[PDB]
Design a protein around this ligand. Structure first.
Ligand SMILES: O=c1ccn([C@@H]2O[C@H](COP(=O)(O)OP(=O)(O)O[C@H]3O[C@H](CO)[C@H](O)[C@H](O)[C@H]3O)[C@@H](O)[C@H]2O)c(=O)[nH]1
Length: 376
C-alpha cells in the first residue's frame, strides 16, 4: 500500500498545510506496512523570498529536501521513512497561495500510484479518480470565510471534490458541506510541544517558576486571522486589562496596520516577527489568547495546550475539539473574554492527564486518520 500526500505548502513556510501534512507523512510511514510519499511545492527563488524567512532560500529542490528532513528529524524521535517529491508551483500573491503548474499527479509514476491524499482538495483539484485507486481529500481551510473577507468557490468546491475524492475529511464542522464527508480532527501536535509541557510540569513540581504572567498570540499578520477581533476586544476593555501585557508574533501584509492599532491602546501590546512556536521564547508564557473564528482547526491552540498553557479562545464550532481540555477557556462575548483572561493570569494552569496528552499526539491523530479514511 502506497500513500501519496499532496499538499499546497512546504516548510519553511510556517502554515498549517505545510506543518500538518509533513507530520502526517512522518507518522503514517512509521505505522509500518505502508509506503509514504509527500508531494510538496518547489518555488522559484523570487517566490521563495515571499513566504520563507528569506534567511532561508534553496537553490534546488534537493536542498529544500535536506532542509525539510533535517527540520522534521530534529522534532520527532524516530528516523523518517517516507519519500519527498516536488511539483513546480507559483505563489499568486492575490490568492495568498501557491498554485500548481503541471499536472501534480505527474510527480507519482502510474506504476506506483495507489492512494492519493489531497490536502486542500479544493485547490489541488483546481487524472485523479483514474490514475489512483483511492483519493481522500482533507479540508484545512474555510475558503468561503477567507475570500468573503478580503479588503463563489462554494459549489465548485463541492463537485470538484466530489468528482475526484472518494472520501472527504473535514478537520472540523467550521467548513463548507462536502460530499462523502466526515468531520474528524486528524491532526496532532509536533511532539516537541508535549515534551515542553512535561518539562513545564516538572518545573512546577520542583517549584521552579514555570510561568511569566503575560499573554501572547501567534499567527500570520492578516486582519482576518484573529487580529481584528483581538484588537477590538483589547480596545473595548482597555481599562479592565490595564495589567495585561500581550505579545503578538507573526509576519504578513497587515503587520504595520496591526502595530499601528496596538500603539493606540492603553495596554502594552507589542508586535513582533513570526517565529517557530516551539522556540524557547514561547516556553514560559502562561496564557495564549486565540480569538480566531476563521480557522478550521487552530493548530496553535493544540500546541499551546500541549505546552501546559491556558488558552482563552472563542466559543466557536472550530474549537469544539479543544473544549474537552480544562485549560481551554471559551468565551461567548467581550465580558467573557476579559473575565476568562483575568482569571487565567491569576491562576496555575491545570495539569494534563496522560489520556489528554495522547489525544493531542500525532500517534493518536494517525489512528483516527487511518480509521476515518477506510485505510484499514
Ligand atoms: O509565526 C508562526 C505562524 C505559524 N506557525 C506554525 O504554523 C502552523 C499552523 O499555524 P496557523 O494554523 O497559525 O497557520 P495557518 O493559519 O497559516 O494554517 C492553516 O491550516 C490550519 C490547518 O492545517 C488552520 O486550521 C487554518 O484554517 C489555515 O489557514 C502551526 O504549527 C504553528 O505553530 C509558527 O510556528 N509560527
Amino acid at each position: 500500500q502506497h500513500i501519496a500526500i499532496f499538499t499546497t505548502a512546504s516548510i519553511p513556510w510556517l502554515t498549517g498545510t505545510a506543518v500538518n501534512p509533513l507530520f502526517r507523512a512522518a507518522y503514517l510511514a512509521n505505522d509500518g506496512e505502508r509506503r509514504v510519499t509527500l508531494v510538496i511545492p518547489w518555488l522559484t527563488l523570487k517566490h521563495q523570498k515571499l513566504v520563507y524567512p528569506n534567511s532561508i532560500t534553496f537553490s534546488s529542490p534537493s536542498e529544500q529536501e535536506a532542509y525539510v528532513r533535517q527540520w522534521l528529524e530534529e522534532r520527532v524521535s524516530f528516523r523518517l521513512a517516507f519519500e519527498i517529491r516536488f511539483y513546480p508551483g507559483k505563489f499568486a500573491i492575490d490568492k495568498r497561495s501557491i498554485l500548481p503548474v503541471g499536472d501534480i499527479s505527474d510527480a507519482i509514476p502510474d506504476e506506483e500510484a495507489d492512494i492519493a491524499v489531497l490536502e486542500e482538495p479544493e485547490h489541488l483539484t483546481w487524472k485523479w479518480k483514474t490514475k489512483f485507486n483511492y483519493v481522500i481529500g482533507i479540508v484545512h481551510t474555510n475558503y468561503l470565510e477567507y475570500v468573503k473577507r478580503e479588503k463563489f468557490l462554494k459549489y465548485l468546491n463541492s463537485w470538484v471534490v466530489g468528482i475526484y475524492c472518494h472520501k472527504v475529511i473535514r478537520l472540523s464542522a467550521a467548513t463548507q458541506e462536502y460530499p462523502k464527508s466526515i468531520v474528524c480532527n486528524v491532526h496532532g501536535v509536533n511532539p516537541k510541544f508535549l515534551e515542553i509541557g512535561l518539562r513545564k510540569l516538572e518545573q512546577q513540581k520542583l517549584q521552579e517558576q514555570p510561568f511569566t504572567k503575560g499573554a501572547y498570540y501567534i499567527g500570520k499578520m492578516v486582519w482576518s486571522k484573529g487580529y481584528k477581533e483581538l484588537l477590538k476586544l483589547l480596545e473595548k476593555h482597555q481599562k479592565e486589562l490595564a495589567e495585561l501585557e500581550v505579545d503578538l508574533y507573526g509576519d504578513g501584509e497587515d503587520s504595520e496596520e496591526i502595530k499601528e492599532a496596538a500603539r493606540k491602546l492603553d495596554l502594552t501590546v507589542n508586535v513582533y516577527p513570526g517565529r517557530d512556536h516551539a522556540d524557547s521564547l514561547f516556553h514560559n508564557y502562561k496564557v495564549f489568547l486565540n480569538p480566531s473564528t476563521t480557522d478550521v482547526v487552530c493548530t496553535t491552540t493544540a500546541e499551546a495546550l500541549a505546552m501546559g498553557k491556558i488558552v482563552v479562545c472563542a466559543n466557536h464550532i472550530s474549537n469544539k475539539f479543544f473544549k474537552q481540555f480544562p485549560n481551554c477557556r471559551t468565551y461567548d462575548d467581550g465580558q467573557g473574554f476579559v473575565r476568562a483572561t483575568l482569571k487565567a493570569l491569576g491562576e496555575q494552569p491545570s495539569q494534563l492527564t496522560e489520556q489528554q496528552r495522547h489525544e493531542l499526539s500525532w500517534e493518536a491523530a494517525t489512528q483516527r486518520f487511518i480509521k476515518v479514511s477506510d485505510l484499514n
